[model samples]
Target: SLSAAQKDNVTSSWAKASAAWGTAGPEFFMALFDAHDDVFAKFSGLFSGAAKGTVKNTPEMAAQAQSFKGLVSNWVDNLDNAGALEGQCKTFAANHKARGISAGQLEAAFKVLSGFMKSYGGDEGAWTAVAGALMGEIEPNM
Candidate 1:
């Protein structure tokens, strides 16, 4: 359970992060693809034959990034609600697993998001707690 202070920190920090996520989030995904080129191959339906530059500009990528941002927002909003967090994480893990995303890739995704949050002045401990909780729920399914 989060302390009231922790919950406040998470909600306030996430609002700032979410604002930038809409634009910066896509670049984070691009960086992930650059770091793990095979990630693009894994999601061939959306990325195959697409150059990095082109993929970065596509509506698909934009919408995907926004969806990711929304998921983060949902988790932040439910920081004090364990059941909601667990349900969301489980569903997310199942969906990603169905798409053939590896546990390592999911870990990498979290790292990318963590770094993004850090860059945006997020509270380190709050981010760490939320990341740890979400990863704990998803890692088993991954």
Candidate 2:
């Protein structure tokens, strides 16, 4: 079930990537990253796990995530030298345009990230409670 959720979550994520960063160029994406750093940091930690303790909502972790955003922004700005990254993003959007993403997709993405964190720590309750809290935090805003 977790695997299924992960797959769906990642799919939605790529879809959002396709939609937001596709034809729009990287500057727009940079703005999205800047605006959604909270979500991105959690997702990053889920993928890397090395950043597990980095989610303390601290100024330091916020700075680290902002650094990641800056890196991404630079890559996007240099897409001409960055190779097919931009083109691939556009193509991905073209391929999946019919499946346009939404806020619900973001919710699912966070759910999967939360699940990964809990599984990493071998704490099922942590998964549910923490994920629910995150969902609650984002739902109204979404």
Candidate 3:
């Protein structure tokens, strides 16, 4: 759960990030892959034979980023209602677990997402709480 002020930071900062969704997506994936090169294997559909060192902007990465930005919006909107947010977390965990995603991979992605949000003027405390709630369900599955 987040405090009133924390929610204010999360939502307001996100509105800015959401507005610049095009730029945020590629940047996020580039940073994520830079932090955890191994994670690129999971996105073979987009990268295929490409090496992490050759990372650059791509339509696939932008597409993935757009999807995640939407997810965060949903997460932000549901902050006041833990139950609604928790359900979304469970479904997310279920899908990723079935994908055989490792807990380490999941955690790394969350960290990268948190950083991405923060870079867009989001508060660290707010994103941390959001990540905690998501991992509450995701951790068990992975």
Candidate with maximal lDDT = 3
Write down the TM-score for model 1.
Answer: 0.84
Report every candidate's CA lDDT.
Answer: 0.77, 0.42, 0.78
lDDT comparison, 1 vs 2, better candidate: 1
Q: Quick one: how many clashes does candidate 3 have? A: 0
**What TM-score quantifies how close candidate 3 is to the native fold?**
0.87
Clashes of each: 0, 0, 0
Tens digits of per-residue lDDT, candidate 3, 84-122, equal: 887888887778778767877888887877777877888
Model 2 segments more than 4 A misplaced: 1-101
lDDT of 1 by residue, 48-85 (tens): 57776678878888888888788888888887788998
State the displacement of the C-alpha of residue 82, model 1, in Å, after optimal TM-score superposition: 0.7
> Model 2, range 1-142, lDDT digits (tens) per residue?
2344443443444334434432333333233444555544544643454343344444444455454344334433332342544443344334334344445655554454444333233244434543453344344433
Residue 42 in model 2: lDDT? 47
The per-residue C-alpha lDDT of model 1 at residue 103 equals 82
Q: Identify the superior model by TM-score, candidate 2 or candidate 3.
A: 3
Local lDDT at 137 for model 1 = 84
Instruction: Report how far off residue 93 is in candidate 3 (Å).
Output: 1.0
Off by over 4 Å in 1: 1-7
Error of 2 at 135 (Å): 1.9
